[PDB]
Design a protein around this ligand. Structure first.
Ligand SMILES: OC[C@H]1O[C@@H](O[C@@H]2[C@@H](CO)O[C@](O)(CO)[C@H]2O)[C@H](O)[C@@H](O)[C@H]1O
Ligand SMILES: [Cl-]
Ligand SMILES: [Cl-]
Ligand SMILES: [Cl-]
Length: 138
């Protein structure tokens, strides 16, 4: 029962073999979830399930540099369901973030921000009950 939006500091940024795990339950009638891995004001990796964009469910990923969003990467596979508990695992690999939901691989997002050790906050927001947010080195 963490307060949302929730900031999880990532000390010394991210690095390959860091695993970030987010446990929560989606609210009933959800509209959105967002993970924002931030480098200061920049968003290195925005992971944004949208429950109703023109009556479709889509995961939007992007990067925000100097206040400008870049080119969206969209994933139609949509493992989240209103009302249901989920697990998001974000594994940093050398050339991308690797995301699994409920133990199933979902997507990868190539590193656009190169200074991984400056990506030192994760913001978790949206229509969830957040249970826990943590990290470990594997
Ligand atoms: O790219 C991620 C960001 O997308 C913004 O929405 C985009 C608008 C602006 O509303 O035009 C699109 O690119 C296509 O319709 C939208 O996806 C969101 O406002 C941001 O929060 C962020 O998700
Ligand atoms: Cl495009
Ligand atoms: Cl749903
Ligand atoms: Cl960079």
């Amino acid at each position: 029962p963490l307060i949302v939006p929730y900031n999880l500091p990532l000390p010394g940024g991210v690095v390959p073999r860091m695993l970030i795990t987010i446990l929560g339950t989606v609210k009933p009638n959800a509209n959105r979830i967002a993970l924002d891995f931030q480098r200061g004001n920049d968003v290195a990796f925005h992971f944004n399930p949208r429950f109703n964009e023109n009556n479709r469910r889509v995961i939007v990923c992007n990067t925000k540099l100097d206040n400008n969003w870049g080119r969206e990467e969209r994933q139609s596979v949509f493992p989240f369901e209103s009302g249901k508990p989920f697990k998001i695992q974000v594994l940093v690999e050398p050339d991308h973030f690797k995301v699994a939901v409920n133990d199933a691989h979902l997507l990868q997002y190539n590193h656009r921000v190169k200074k991984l050790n400056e990506i030192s906050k994760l913001g978790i927001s949206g229509d969830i009950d957040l249970t826990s947010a943590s990290y470990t080195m594997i």
